[PDB]
């Protein structure tokens, strides 16, 4: 509620990596892939459509955390 609204580059990297590792483990792709064999291209296609049900849990230096949605996060 007080951290930045945008998605840092490290968060984009980790979210793409995790979504790709999920797709590669036979997870349903909600993005209507169009003949591409790379799970990372599919993960980028999903991130551009705002279809990723993951919750970035930003940790503050004292243990307190804030749970943001990958949908409710301004991707640059």
């Amino acid at each position: 509620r007080i951290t930045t609204p945008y998605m840092t580059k490290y968060e984009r990297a980790r979210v793409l990596g995790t979504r790709a590792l999920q797709i590669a483990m036979c997870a349903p792709v909600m993005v209507e892939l169009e003949g591409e064999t790379d799970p990372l291209l599919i993960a980028m296609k999903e991130l551009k459509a705002r279809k990723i049900p993951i919750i970035i849990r930003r940790y503050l230096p004292d243990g307190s955390y804030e749970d943001w949605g990958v949908d409710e996060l301004i991707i640059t």
């Binding site: 990297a13 980790r14 979210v15 993951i54 919750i55 970035i56 849990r57 930003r58 940790y59 749970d67």
Partner: protein, 57 residues
């Protein structure tokens, strides 16, 4: 010497003096440095590892 990480501080220099110290003091390590995080096989606590992902059910 004024450092809160025994696993660091022994990956630098005089590792046996810093181990003897940490041993006769019961010094505890929190595995939050990059060195203490690479010694016990964790993910460093900066850059890409600074947050969780928490797949919702």
């Amino acid at each position: 010497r004024s450092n809160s990480s025994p696993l660091q501080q022994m990956t630098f220099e005089t590792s046996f003096q810093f181990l003897k110290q940490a041993t006769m003091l019961g010094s505890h390590d929190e595995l939050r440095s990059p060195s203490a995080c690479l010694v016990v096989g964790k993910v460093v606590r900066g850059g890409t590892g600074l947050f969780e992902l928490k797949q919702p059910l």
